């Protein structure tokens, strides 16, 4: 379960807006000393797509990717790979990943940080789906 | 009433007059593509500009306008064109073929037979039936001029030899007044017989290609074929799932990923009539 | 010193390494166009990207760089490239050919003879001498592979028959090491003799076409011609109006609408030397 949970919280961090994540992290006021193993680096991730969506692979351009690595005092390593060029956001994501790897912070951050972020993202998606679904063309109703 | 701030039918009188002259010439030369100085319309080229211009040049205040795309009045582009014409002319509109005076259609002829004084206007992307054989207009103009239609016969013969059947299933070329080979617009082979000796005038507009051609009422329109390979229309093993008709062109509606599907009339007005009869 | 925030010479070490391997291969196969994975530079393709990449891959801290376009150091593109290289490498620059260690040129070889350890880098728009004869690379690759240069000889023979002279006045094809037909870049026929048995290494970069080819020092470079139509360089009835030289390529400067014009050395450094001598 550790791998799946780590993937889930890293995905939530990556999809989180930098502003809301920063605000929530500041509100929590988590005290933790960490050293930046890898300074946030902004480069490119090569995009691979499939012919017809399921066939042979081909390179469909590139996208900006920022990666960061931090270490906590106890040696825990936090990593982050986020699309875009927000270096501070990547550093925060790596820090949160490191903290989540700690037992004392995992539950608290899941209940107070990861779950609210996921809920907010799901709400924003729900709302835009409601707006986009108004453009659906209705042809038949089964009476 | 027209209260949109534009001229009635959105076209200046000069463009209407030029299109009217082109229409008269086309009527006088059935099946011949009459060039005309088409203008750019609010709709993009290829979305029915030629038919819109023809309707604008022919439509009047007392006309009842029916707009159908794929045989349905509620189709998105049909709705857009109908709304535009209501805005710029304020004419009455109907979904009933028998109540309509002007019918602007895309890829279908109504199942309901047309009557006298009715005009059906076709949206034509490719007015040249030989285009897919000879892409160049410089050659097709001469071929039509000299009645050099042998390449079309060769194409049909090769299709029969290769696949055992003629590969053209829509926009099937026809012979008009025994002389001009004409493209009937992308109507299915199903609707081609309706064009023969039709009491209603037929007008065809290709705005992007700048061509207008017409079939006068009661004019011979014969689909190209062979005696041993006679012209055959599309057929289905299922009737319409709504009205149960077996003599109407059917569109296929996919219901779910599993594979369930149904077939319903493309002509929505005919389906409504057939369902209200029974 | 490099203080621009980019890597020395603006290229990542992987691209430098690939270009260096390509350069070594080209040196080992004189006159052959070596494909290489050229990258998009701050300059647009066709403005000297290949030469810029070659210089970046070969340039060092101690190198003295001379950049000339049309034989002039003050030419706009030459100034731009020199400023870019100063920004990204901080190398010393000079307008004197004899003081330069790396010379990046566009369409001219300096009048001053080159010496040992000097590298002259040519900006090449079309690295294929047969391109204007056969536009397709699929065919020219095979033609070079099989030494099928007969089409070039046919072209020269037809030019002689039609105009009485070979129509190619710049980028004149040459034969390298008796084997590969090579495009010398758009240098005039005047500069082609300088390529024969040149003590300096010659490098040619076509960034847009992704080709690198080289002529090692002391390599035979013979312009294609005929015994009765020998290779002849451009000539002028007037000497340079500034220095008075008669052995230099001359550019024509139009002074006024009336028709007054003068001719001055394209190689500005050679003109300066010649004027300061007398």
């Amino acid at each position: 379960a550790d791998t799946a949970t780590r993937q889930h919280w890293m995905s939530v961090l990556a999809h989180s807006q930098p502003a809301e994540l920063a605000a929530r992290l500041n509100a929590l006021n988590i005290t933790a000393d960490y050293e930046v193993i890898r300074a946030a680096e902004t480069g490119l991730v090569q995009i691979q797509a499939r012919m017809g969506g399921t066939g042979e692979r081909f390179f469909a351009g590139d996208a900006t990717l920022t990666r960061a690595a931090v270490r906590l005092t106890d040696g825990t390593l936090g990593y982050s790979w986020v699309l875009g060029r927000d270096k501070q956001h990547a550093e925060r994501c790596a820090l949160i990943d490191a903290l989540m790897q700690q037992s004392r912070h995992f539950q608290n951050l899941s209940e107070t940080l990861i779950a609210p972020l996921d809920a907010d993202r799901m709400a924003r998606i729900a709302a835009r789906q409601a707006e986009v679904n108004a453009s659906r063309v209705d042809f038949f109703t089964m009476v | 009433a027209n209260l949109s701030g534009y001229n009635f039918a959105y076209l200046d009188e000069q463009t209407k007059r030029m299109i009217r002259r082109a229409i008269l010439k086309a009527v006088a030369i059935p099946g011949y593509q009459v060039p005309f100085g088409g203008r750019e319309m609010p709709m993009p080229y290829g979305w029915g500009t030629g038919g819109i211009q023809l309707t604008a040049s022919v439509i009047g205040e007392s006309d009842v306008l029916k707009v159908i795309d794929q045989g349905a009045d509620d189709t998105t582009n049909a709705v857009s064109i109908r709304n535009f014409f209501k805005r710029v002319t304020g004419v009455n509109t109907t979904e009933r073929t028998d109540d309509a005076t002007l019918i602007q259609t895309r890829h279908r002829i109504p199942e309901t037979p047309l009557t006298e004084d009715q005009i059906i206007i076709f949206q034509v992307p490719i007015p040249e039936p030989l285009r897919f054989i000879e892409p160049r207009e410089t050659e097709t103009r001469t071929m039509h001029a000299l009645e050099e239609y042998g390449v079309m016969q060769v194409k049909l013969y090769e299709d029969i030899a290769r696949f055992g059947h003629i590969a053209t299933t829509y926009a099937y070329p026809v012979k008009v007044n025994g002389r001009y080979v004409m493209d009937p617009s992308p109507i299915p082979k199903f609707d081609n017989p309706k064009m023969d000796m039709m009491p209603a005038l037929q007008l065809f507009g290709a705005g992007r290609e700048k061509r207008i051609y017409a079939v006068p009422p009661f004019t011979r329109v014969e689909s190209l074929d062979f005696d041993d390979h006679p012209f055959t229309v599309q057929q289905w093993d299922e009737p319409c799932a709504i009205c149960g008709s077996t003599h109407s062109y059917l569109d296929e509606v996919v219901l779910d990923d599993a594979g369930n599907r149904m077939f319903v009339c493309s002509d929505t007005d005919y389906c409504r009539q057939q369902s209200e009869a029974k | 010193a490099n203080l621009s925030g980019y890597n020395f010479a603006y290229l990542d070490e992987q691209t430098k390494r690939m270009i260096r391997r390509a350069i070594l291969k080209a040196v080992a196969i004189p006159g052959y166009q070596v494909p290489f994975g050229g990258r998009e530079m701050p300059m647009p393709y066709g403005w000297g990207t290949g030469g810029i990449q070659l210089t970046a891959s070969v340039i060092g801290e101690s190198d003295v760089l001379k950049v000339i376009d049309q034989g002039a150091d003050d030419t706009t593109n030459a100034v731009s490239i020199r400023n870019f290289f100063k920004r990204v490498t901080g190398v010393n620059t000079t307008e004197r050919t004899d003081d330069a260690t790396l010379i990046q040129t566009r369409h001219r070889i300096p009048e001053t003879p080159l010496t040992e350890d000097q590298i002259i880098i040519f900006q090449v728009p079309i690295p294929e001498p047969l391109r204007f004869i056969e536009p397709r690379e699929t065919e020219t690759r095979t033609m070079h592979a099989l030494e099928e240069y007969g089409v070039m000889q046919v072209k020269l023979y037809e030019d002689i028959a039609r105009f009485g002279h070979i129509a190619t006045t710049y980028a004149y094809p040459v034969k390298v090491n008796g084997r590969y037909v090579m495009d010398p870049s758009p240098i005039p026929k005047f500069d082609n003799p300088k390529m024969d048995m040149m003590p300096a290494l010659q490098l040619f970069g076509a960034g847009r076409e992704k080709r690198i080819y080289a002529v090692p020092p002391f390599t035979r470079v013979e312009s294609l011609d005929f015994d009765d139509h020998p290779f002849t360089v451009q000539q002028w009835d007037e000497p340079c109006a500034i220095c008075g030289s008669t052995h230099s390529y001359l550019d024509e400067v139009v002074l006024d609408d009336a028709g007054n014009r003068m001719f001055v050395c394209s190689d500005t450094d050679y003109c300066r030397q010649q004027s300061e001598a007398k």
Binding site: - | - | E147, Y157, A161
Partner: protein, 250 residues
């Protein structure tokens, strides 16, 4: 030892289309005519032995060197310097956008010629040899007639004084007078210069007057071979007897 050797050569587009199990030897200074039915594979065999069609079976040895085991560059060098190829349709062996002089001079320059005047003089000499006027040297082959184009192709493929010439119906499109001129020219080249010719022809008179040995091909197989006059006057295989009985007597 044979200039050209063919052993078990076979190339088939489909069962019965092409040639199969063809072997023969050609020496310098002799002519090997090939006669047969339209559709017997004569052209396919000519292409295969001229390095224009890779066979499915068998080997071809030129001066003891396997033809298709050599590099493509070497085969192109052969076809460029010492091999002549005359196609049935002259325009297939001619450059449409290149003048007749250029068409003749391409081969000369490919052999090392680099004097424009000498190339022009040789082209005019060969045009006069095939009786083409020397004033048509600068005219494109599209302006030439069928016989003129055929003669231009022959001159182009004979200007380099090659050692082996593969011809496909070279007499086609030629009036009998220029045809006799061409026959005399080919005989002179074969005898004086030891030229070797593999000629595909349907005019059995030209094969009689020119070919030293004959192959008779039918449905992709060699049915009869031997001395030209022996085959023509003493045919053995039914097809050959039909073929020589079909000749129009003048």
């Amino acid at each position: 030892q044979p200039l050209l050797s063919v052993n078990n050569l076979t190339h088939l587009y489909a069962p019965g289309k092409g040639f199969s199990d063809v072997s023969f030897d050609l020496w310098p200074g002799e002519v090997l005519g090939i006669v047969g039915e339209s559709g017997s594979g004569k052209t396919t065999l000519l292409k295969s032995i001229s390095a224009r069609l890779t066979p499915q079976q068998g080997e071809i040895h030129y001066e003891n060197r396997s033809l298709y085991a050599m590099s493509e560059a070497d085969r192109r060098r052969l076809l460029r310097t010492e091999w002549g190829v005359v196609h049935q349709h002259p325009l297939d062996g001619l450059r449409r956008q290149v003048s007749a002089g250029g068409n003749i001079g391409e081969r000369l320059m490919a052999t090392g010629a680099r004097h424009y005047g000498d190339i022009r003089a040789t082209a005019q000499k060969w045009l006069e040899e095939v009786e083409i006027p020397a004033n048509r040297i600068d005219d494109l082959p599209t302006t030439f007639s069928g016989g003129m184009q055929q003669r231009l192709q022959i001159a182009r493929n004979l200007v380099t004084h090659p050692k082996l010439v593969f011809m496909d119906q070279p007499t086609g499109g030629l009036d009998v007078s220029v045809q006799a001129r061409l026959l005399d020219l080919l005989r002179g080249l074969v005898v004086e210069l030891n030229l070797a010719v593999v000629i595909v022809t349907h005019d059995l008179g030209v094969a009689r007057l020119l070919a030293d040995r004959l192959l008779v091909m039918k449905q992709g197989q060699v049915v009869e071979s031997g001395l030209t006059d022996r085959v023509l006057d003493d045919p053995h295989h039914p097809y050959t007897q039909l073929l020589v009985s079909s000749v129009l007597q003048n």
